[PDB]
Design a protein around this ligand. Sequence first.
Ligand SMILES: O=C1N2C=C(c3ccc(O)cc3)N=C(Cc3ccccc3)C2=N[C@@]1(Cc1ccc(O)cc1)OO
Length: 186
Amino acid sequence: AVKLKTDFDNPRWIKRHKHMFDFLDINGNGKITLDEIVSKASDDICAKLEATPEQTKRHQVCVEAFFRGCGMEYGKEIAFPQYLDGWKQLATSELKKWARNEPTLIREWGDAVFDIFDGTITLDEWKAYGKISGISPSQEDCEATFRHCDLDNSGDLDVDEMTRQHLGFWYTLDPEADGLYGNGVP
Ligand SMILES: O=C1N2C=C(c3ccc(O)cc3)N=C(Cc3ccccc3)C2=N[C@@]1(Cc1ccc(O)cc1)OO
């Protein structure tokens, strides 16, 4: 039962997103652009995963939409506070879509990522994504991810499940989502 109540002033949610912000801020100058996010998605991740140009393009479209949801844009340098406001807007919109059974941006992003590893992904594939995207380079943390989630009979992870977990993790600080990335993301 996905938590749909938001908790935007909870220091743990804020911290989760500051962590991710700093993670995206290679430079460390306190500012990120859509250009850097998309380059990470397309030049870094998709290339290393050896996705087809079609998969690469659709993944890029999903990433563009997702981060535009939080106010990001090409050539626009964004600092953390504005970024976080943008995330409040994104979360709100996404939860409204989810409630109405309209596809979320996080779901569609998920569909692209899973399609690259193709309707499930394995623990090894997730460790691969973890190290390549850099969100979860500790294989133990990825194993903690697979222990956290409800896997299928094959021991693999479903996109429905990962979407529910991600809704809980990024949008609502759902207690049921805590530890989704092990100790990799607070
Ligand atoms: O959810 C994910 N992410 C969330 C954030 C992120 C970034 C900033 C925040 O403030 C909060 C979250 N950053 C990255 C990594 C990434 C960032 C940018 C471009 C490419 C990849 C990321 N990768 C995902 C992709 C994914 C999506 C749906 C799935 O079902 C499975 C995998 O997997 O967990």
